[PDB]
């Protein structure tokens, strides 16, 4: 099927583009129900939890805002008291009450402070010439609760430190760490940091056994008694950041509640609107046009007509660049130009590539017809992931049912690539049986490919080239091709469909548009097409053409300008080619 401009258009229409936006801030965790409800449960039940989602989601910001709205009982006073001259314990009094104990001591009624006072009793009994409570923390409300985010999870920062006054030390030289500051509230840490600092095991011992040891230096140490830990820990990390941790059975035991963010949200008015409010809260001066463009780029970042990328910090970062281009103002234009400027800043490799193509240093065709040749479409695996066309040739000779992927034999093709070739072979053997095993050897080469290549998305291109070589069928070089194929010859979905399409358009444009150039792609990828303005208008101008297909044969018909049947059709020519190949092989 041909995809009209109408079918291809996916952009949000803009009305009153320069009108300022005025909208209330959405609540934290908007469009992230799962994560919020998981977090809600964790709060309600006092469970430890971990927030998991890709980078740049705004997980930290969402977390701190959510915990900002919370209410707890005012935290107890927290102190170290000595139980000896070489021992100290961690103790809670009700709040503000340590200063009465401290001052009573400052002389020389508090039920909780018993053991400290018992051992507080023989200077007079031996003239024997360090003893006053060390306050760690105290606060005047549990609203908001204690919220301590320690991004750098070293032992001292988690557990506090011993200072040494020359060396001697005592209770008053013990400083607290994040763990102490988070009592009665929330401690937030990064999973990656716990690993990189090697403090995971000591962190388990604090949670599981209440061991919280101030960091020493390797003269003499105070023993420090364990105490019952009162805090809720929330870990933050990417899915990969948590896999080091999930292998330790201790992790799932300790952190029962997963709070997982979706990498995308439904592309809805309610999320567009929520995005506007969030941008306004961030301090941007936003126009309707600017909001609409950012909302659409978010859909395009997701490669989904019906979803939008949830990475609020990526969207904010693009908005920041747009703002500078609009002189402080976030307009449609400012956003289009900021998107275009990022592309330009990373365009050197494509400009080099296009120059090479224009010079013939890379040999590519975008017009005419040729047998056993097709433009397939690849993606360069370096950000920002430019698509490019790659010329693929198929050559058929009489031989013993062999399909040779030259790139995979040479060691450039990966496993999934190899699998795609074997799948085609399964198709061809089982499809053409009248001569027993296939009477041809077919060799496939990505012609000027000097690098490793991986994936199944060349399946369709390879199969149609093979069929062309088999039947001597001239194929259009003005349509590039992408798609995977299964063993039954159906065409399956591929990745990076926008980059692939846009990359062929870019070479066609650089060589001068013919007016008949285009791309053939999987019907299954229709939901992924979020093509850039310039390709859309070229399709609207009749200057470029997209075909969606469901089978390999459908693709071959478009390429060889004919139907499989109505014999004189392509199928009899393919059969005729095989008959010829079989005769040369046997007689």
């Amino acid at each position: 099927m041909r995809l009209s401009y109408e079918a291809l258009e996916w952009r949000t229409p803009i009305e009153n583009s320069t009108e300022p936006v005025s909208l209330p801030p959405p609540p934290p965790f908007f469009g992230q129900e799962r994560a919020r409800e998981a977090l809600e449960l964790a709060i309600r039940g006092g469970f430890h939890a971990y927030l998991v989602g890709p980078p740049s989601l705004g997980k930290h910001e969402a977390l701190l805002a959510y915990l900002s709205t919370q209410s707890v009982e005012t935290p107890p006073d927290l102190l170290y008291v000595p139980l000896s001259e070489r021992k100290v314990a961690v103790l809670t009094l009700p709040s503000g009450q340590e200063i009465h104990l401290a001052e009573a001591v400052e002389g020389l009624r508090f039920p909780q402070a018993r053991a400290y006072l018992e051992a507080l009793r023989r200077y007079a009994e031996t003239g024997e010439p360090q003893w006053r409570p060390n306050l760690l923390t105290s606060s005047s409300s549990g609203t908001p609760p204690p919220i301590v985010y320690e991004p750098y999870a070293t032992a001292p920062r988690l557990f506090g430190r011993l200072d040494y006054l020359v060396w001697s030390t005592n209770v008053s030289l013990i400083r607290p760490g994040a763990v102490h500051r988070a009592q009665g509230g929330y401690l937030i840490l990064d999973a990656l940091s716990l690993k990189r600092e090697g403090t995971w095991e000591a962190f388990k011992r604090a949670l599981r056994n209440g061991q919280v040891e101030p960091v020493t230096e390797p003269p003499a140490g105070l023993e420090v008694e364990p105490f019952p830990i009162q805090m809720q820990v929330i870990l933050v990390g990417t899915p990969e950041a948590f896999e080091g941790l999930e292998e330790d059975p201790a992790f799932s035991e300790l952190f029962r509640i997963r709070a997982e963010f979706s990498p995308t949200l439904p592309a809805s008015p309610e999320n567009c609107t929520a995005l506007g409010g969030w941008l306004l809260a961030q301090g941007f001066q936003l126009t309707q046009g600017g909001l609409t463009r950012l909302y659409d780029e978010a859909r395009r970042m997701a490669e989904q007509r019906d979803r939008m990328d949830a990475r609020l910090v990526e969207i904010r970062a693009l908005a920041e660049e747009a703002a500078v281009l609009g002189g402080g103002l976030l307009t449609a234009e400012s956003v289009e130009q900021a998107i275009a400027a990022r592309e330009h800043r990373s365009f050197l490799s494509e400009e080099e590539f296009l120059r090479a193509v224009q010079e013939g240093v890379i040999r590519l065709r975008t017009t005419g017809r040729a047998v056993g040749e097709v433009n397939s479409l690849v993606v360069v695996e370096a950000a920002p992931y430019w698509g490019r066309p790659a010329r693929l040739t198929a050559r058929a000779a009489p031989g013993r049912d062999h399909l040779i992927s030259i790139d995979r034999e040479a060691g450039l093709g990966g496993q999934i690539f190899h699998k795609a070739v074997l799948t085609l072979a399964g198709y061809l053997r089982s499809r053409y049986i009248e001569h027993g095993s296939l009477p041809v050897t077919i060799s496939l080469a990505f012609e000027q490919n000097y690098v490793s290549i991986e994936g199944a998305s060349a399946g369709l291109a390879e199969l149609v080239a093979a069929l062309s070589a088999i039947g001597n069928l001239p194929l259009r070089q003005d349509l590039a091709v992408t798609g995977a194929v299964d063993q039954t010859g159906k065409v399956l979905a591929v990745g990076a469909i926008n980059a692939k399409v846009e990359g062929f358009f870019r070479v066609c444009k650089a060589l001068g548009l013919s007016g008949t150039q285009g791309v053939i792609l999987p019907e299954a990828n229709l939901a992924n097409l979020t093509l850039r303005a310039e390709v859309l208008e070229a399709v609207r101008a009749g200057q470029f053409h997209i075909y969606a297909v469901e089978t390999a044969e459908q693709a071959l018909e478009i390429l060889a300008g004919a139907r499989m049947e109505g014999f004189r059709g392509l199928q009899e020519k393919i059969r005729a080619g095989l008959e010829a190949f079989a005769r040369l092989e046997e007689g």
Binding site: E454, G455, S457, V494
Partner: peptide, 5 residues
């Protein structure tokens, strides 16, 4: 860089 299809 390595390439994906």
């Amino acid at each position: 860089a390595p390439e994906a299809v």
